[PDB]
Design a protein around this ligand. Structure first.
Ligand SMILES: CCCCCCCC/C=C/CCCCCCCC(=O)OC[C@H](O)CO
Ligand SMILES: CCCCCCCC/C=C/CCCCCCCC(=O)OC[C@H](O)CO
Ligand SMILES: CCCCCCCC/C=C/CCCCCCCC(=O)OC[C@H](O)CO
Ligand SMILES: CCCCCCCC/C=C\CCCCCCCC(=O)OC[C@H](O)CO
Ligand SMILES: CCCCCCCC/C=C\CCCCCCCC(=O)OC[C@H](O)CO
Ligand SMILES: CCCCCCCC/C=C\CCCCCCCC(=O)OC[C@H](O)CO
Ligand SMILES: CCCCCCCC/C=C\CCCCCCCC(=O)OC[C@H](O)CO
Ligand SMILES: CCCCCCCC/C=C\CCCCCCCC(=O)OC[C@H](O)CO
Ligand SMILES: CCCCCCCC/C=C\CCCCCCCC(=O)OC[C@H](O)CO
Ligand SMILES: CCCCCCCC/C=C\CCCCCCCC(=O)OC[C@H](O)CO
Ligand SMILES: CCCCCCCC/C=C\CCCCCCCC(=O)OC[C@H](O)CO
Ligand SMILES: CCCCCCCC/C=C\CCCCCCCC(=O)OC[C@H](O)CO
Ligand SMILES: *C\C=C(C)/C=C/C=C(C)/C=C/C1=C(C)CCCC1(C)C
Ligand SMILES: *C\C=C(C)/C=C/C=C(C)/C=C/C1=C(C)CCCC1(C)C
Ligand SMILES: *C\C=C(C)/C=C/C=C(C)/C=C/C1=C(C)CCCC1(C)C
Lengths: 230, 230, 230
């Protein structure tokens, strides 16, 4: 394939596929209805990402957008991936602390705005406008992280000790992990164009694998996903 | 900007943004889980509309459709906005009367058909076919309003007095408000072409602000959104 | 209309419309909240299919895709139809056996992958890649059917006798019905090109009517949809 970033797309596809298979096997026989929910959510995430990375690898999840007087390749499939995987990851965190339905709707709604406006910015042909959308997208991200930090941390400390501790780790990972995305966008070819596309693709692949496989390995090795029973 | 309707798009963007901020502040500190749901729903609505109005203002939410032997500008972002905000508004009404899950699925499903077929009609290149889709869309709207009037009014009179009264007002507003949309479509440039695009845009902006901010001001000033407690 | 398959599109539109009307009338007056859910789900299915078949009939739900050195007409509206109707049909089956929330999320998620990857394969311009997507789509289908057969059959035998029997019939129909779809795709013009488009359209219309009207007639004539009451 005549795209230098192909190597990072192939590696990402393989790792998401292997992650999906592992979770699928690990989840066999689990009957606790609570654990079944976490396994369903956490296995679906890398299965979706697998299909999206494959679509980028084969060239389908790519388009050309003119801005800055040039044809810029844009992997729109990245955003389709995040559109579906980020709300599932939020659902994992919300179920852990038994968040109320009102707060879940707020987080998922803000997440849709986050990804939707990011996509609009990626496809926008007026260069200066691209960063208006980036700003709105990042504001929605900060609202999410505010809720996860100050909204959820209070509900967790009153819960089981294994629920409060697992959430604390997954929360710190999320804040650091989520916050890198808008930075890579700003410095890569969709934004300021300081880092070339092949390195931009590597950085998003490292982040995506950490979030869609790494995060799941941490959650599914915790005792919190099971109900307290004899 | 070289579009005469730009003024109405700028005004709509500003009003949705101001409405979102107001609701966001008003909702701070609210802890009653019932009120949290209404604030989550009712704040998300104008935040979505804000992004959609901005996308029309900057030119992204617009396309050209040939029919009647002319290039007709179509603001497809209007429909993307309604696709997400009208089911949230229905959820507000359904939660108020504690509607059963079966009736909610019917309303949301009929609402998706309503907006989906309206979009198809807006993008249809055969002029006469456009009104076939308008007719199907309007039939789905009448089903919704039938349920809100005859379906829900019975469940409300048995509920708390502040729930029955709030719903009655929001119901009358909804019937009048919702019914104007297909009329403006039919008379504006998407339909018969009697009213020019700049006035059509003004009329939809007046309606959208009434529905996405106005409606919310009425709901969130009612006692019905809180649980009965000491 | 200058497309020989138009006759099968017109017939499909009519049958979905008639099916929608029948279910709509049959459901009048039903007040049992459990039966209301099944009627809501089962009436929405053919109403969606009606709009999609109409969009194919009028030419809107069609596009041209170059592969094998030819312009191949692709009815993308088929996939939009299935995207919404197949998860509703799964919800019908899941509610019948009172499946847990974890298993429902798994089935609906796998169903979205099934249809999404099928659509990608239909729109893919590299001929050999089309069948890669077909393979992934079919694997997701087999996971669904595995769960319906081995996952759900165990939960049903412990339920009411009228619930276990109704599900058994709807399960056998589903396995045979669902499995024909990937076969028709492979042999028709989207795949190997052995069967011409007009016969391919007939076969999918026969299948769609069986699934979106036939299946519903079986379910809504069963006692299982009502709660056990005096
Ligand atoms: C988890 C255990 C494994 C840890 C692994 C962490 C890797 C994550 C970071 C990678 C960035 C790599 C940056 C590579 C930069 C190459 C770009 C380049 O060639 O820049 C020179 C240019 O030609 C002229 O300026
Ligand atoms: C809430 C408090 C404020 C209430 C505000 C309510 C406004 C809503 C209606 C506006 C329609 C305005 C119609 C303006 C018509 C102008 C079109 C025009 O110029 O038509 C003449 C044409 O050039 C030759 O026929
Ligand atoms: C439910 C009660 C009614 C049951 C009804 C079941 C119909 C389902 C199957 C139809 C396939 C029809 C196949 C028709 C084949 C025609 C194609 C043709 O013309 O092939 C010859 C070709 O020209 C040179 O090989
Ligand atoms: C000029 C201003 C323009 C408008 C601002 C930018 C809009 C997009 C950014 C962020 C989304 C904000 C969050 C949207 C969801 C709010 C939900 C909410 O208020 O939830 C309360 C509930 O009590 C919780 O549990
Ligand atoms: C509880 C549920 C809450 C759900 C909240 C969802 C909020 C989504 C809002 C805005 C993003 C809209 C993004 C739309 C991008 C479409 C781009 C597109 O397809 O454009 C066609 C073509 O490329 C160019 O005309
Ligand atoms: C809490 C998480 C927050 C996450 C969000 C943080 C956003 C701000 C970060 C960096 C912007 C730094 C400025 C980047 C713009 C540089 C523009 C430019 O011209 O760069 C030239 C280049 O440095 C040589 O060629
Ligand atoms: C020729 C006829 C063509 C077909 C007709 C036009 C289809 C589109 C129009 C309206 C949607 C109708 C409503 C769809 C949802 C029905 C849900 C239902 O029946 O709900 C029963 C439940 O008991 C309630 O609580
Ligand atoms: C419980 C959930 C119930 C959900 C019920 C949902 C019903 C939606 C049905 C029909 C509208 C379909 C509209 C599809 C419009 C797509 C147009 C498009 O993108 O066309 C591409 C291009 O512009 C031209 O080929
Ligand atoms: C309950 C809510 C129901 C809401 C839905 C109501 C729909 C019917 C309303 C108006 C149609 C009136 C006819 C409009 C068509 C006029 C066509 C035409 O040629 O108009 C010429 C013009 O008047 C001079 O140039
Ligand atoms: C190389 C391998 C590539 C990756 C494989 C192909 C991916 C797409 C195919 C099938 C989806 C599989 C099902 C996805 C959903 C799994 C849900 C789950 O594990 O559910 C457990 C729960 O306990 C249940 O009740
Ligand atoms: C609990 C919820 C779980 C939800 C699980 C959903 C999984 C969907 C995954 C992959 C399919 C993606 C298909 C995307 C197809 C878009 C094609 C398109 O519009 O392409 C534009 C143009 O035609 C060419 O660039
Ligand atoms: C449980 C449900 C499973 C459902 C999924 C079953 C998939 C496999 C079925 C058939 C493939 C048979 C081979 C088809 C490929 C034929 C290619 C070819 O060249 O055919 C030439 C033609 O026969 C003369 O011209
Ligand atoms: C795949 C898993 C995760 C957690 C992915 C998260 C992605 C983001 C947080 C992306 C955020 C963006 C922002 C905030 C600005 C516009 C561009 C992005 C969509 C990359
Ligand atoms: C933004 C809030 C509301 C309540 C918007 C409602 C929009 C409609 C009811 C639109 C209905 C249409 C019909 C009935 C006919 C096809 C064209 C429309 C989509 C405008
Ligand atoms: C309308 C109701 C049903 C049950 C439709 C089901 C459709 C499928 C099971 C289609 C499956 C496909 C596969 C498995 C392979 C790719 C192509 C298809 C989408 C046709």
């Amino acid at each position: 394939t005549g795209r230098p970033e192909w190597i990072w797309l192939a590696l990402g596809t393989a790792l998401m596929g292997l992650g999906t298979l592992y979770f699928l096997v690990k989840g066999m026989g689990v009957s606790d209805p609570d654990a079944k929910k976490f396994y369903a959510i956490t296995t679906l995430v890398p299965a979706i990402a697998f299909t999206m990375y494959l679509s980028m690898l084969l060239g389908y999840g790519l388009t050309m957008v003119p801005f800055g007087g040039e044809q810029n390749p844009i992997y729109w499939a990245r955003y389709a991936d995040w559109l579906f995987t980020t709300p599932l990851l939020l659902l994992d965190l919300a179920l852990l602390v038994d968040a109320d339905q009102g707060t879940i709707l707020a987080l998922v709604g803000a997440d849709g705005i986050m990804i939707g406006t990011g996509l609009v910015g990626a496809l926008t042909k007026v260069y200066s406008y691209r960063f208006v959308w980036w700003a709105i997208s990042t504001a929605a991200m900060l609202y999410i992280l505010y809720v996860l930090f100050f909204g959820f941390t209070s509900k967790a400390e009153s819960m089981r000790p294994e629920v409060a501790s697992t959430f604390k780790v997954l929360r710190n990972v999320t804040v650091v992990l989520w916050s890198a995305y808008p930075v890579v966008w700003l410095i890569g070819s969709e934004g300021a164009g300081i880092v070339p596309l092949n390195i931009e693709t590597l950085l998003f692949m490292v982040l995506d694998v950490s979030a869609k496989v790494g995060f799941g390995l941490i959650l599914l090795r915790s005792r919190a996903i099971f109900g307290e029973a004899e």
